Amino acid sequence: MATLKVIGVGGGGNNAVNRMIDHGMNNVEFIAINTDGQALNLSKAESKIQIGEKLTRGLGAGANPEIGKKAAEESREQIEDAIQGADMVFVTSGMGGGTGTGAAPVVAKIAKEMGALTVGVVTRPFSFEGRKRQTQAAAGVEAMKAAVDTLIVIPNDRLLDIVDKSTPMMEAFKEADNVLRQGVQGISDLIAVSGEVNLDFADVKTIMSNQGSALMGIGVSSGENRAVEAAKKAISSPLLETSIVGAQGVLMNITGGESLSLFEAQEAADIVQDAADEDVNMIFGTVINPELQDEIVVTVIATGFD
Ligand SMILES: Nc1nc2c(ncn2[C@@H]2O[C@H](COP(=O)(O)OP(=O)(O)O)[C@@H](O)[C@H]2O)c(=O)[nH]1
């Protein structure tokens, strides 16, 4: 049974790991990586790797990515030991800073060289943080892309679009965590359950292995048009840099009660096929969960973007 690990690198990444632990999560081992030893000490994670102690003496990297990179390379062996056993690694980090921008691509490379299916979920900085930080974040993104199997980018500017003028920052940040947390739970649930039309970790590898950009989403709905509405919500990408448009591979799992109809599955599949605007290699699954009365859950992982 496949082991999933979530690895937070730098301040943003360790904040995401803490908020996900607070939210509550099972069958996933969390690893916190940072140069900042003060922040690590406040990590709710079980495994904690302080990187670059020699180099930073427990301080953060400031805004210099080469420090993050060297810190990660210095601590390769400890990174390897914490990863060991992972079939899948999710690497989360905020791009722009000195630790994440530099260290996260190295953590990704290590995870992948060890044989883990390696997914990145990273932020780009807010426009208000200024051009040099945006440009620094962009070099990190490109480095992440070269190091991972699949990459999901969340531009922090998109948080301003969905939030209104009084939404607390911390509630806004929680919206960005949903991306990673629902992707991890969707895959976790696929592994755990033998569905009526079953998808497993081999199907995750087919869609995600050596692919570049990705979209991961979950949609939930009920009543009339539940299938169309849940599929639409699975692929709606307000926070994402990569939309469904141009996807050539899709993993799509539908979960419902005993009322789940064949017609509904087709409708959901067509919503996704049509929104991609490509001939999509669909890998389809269905799970009957009799606990569900009138809800259906549509899970989408999309890759193969040119
Ligand atoms: N969405 C989100 N973005 C964050 C968070 N913390 C930091 N950031 C963003 O990530 C960037 C890097 O900050 P940080 O990770 O602390 O730098 P590092 O520790 O040097 O890697 C910042 O410029 C922000 O754009 C967070 O909790 N949520």
Ligand SMILES: [Ca+2]
């Ligand atoms: Ca399954």
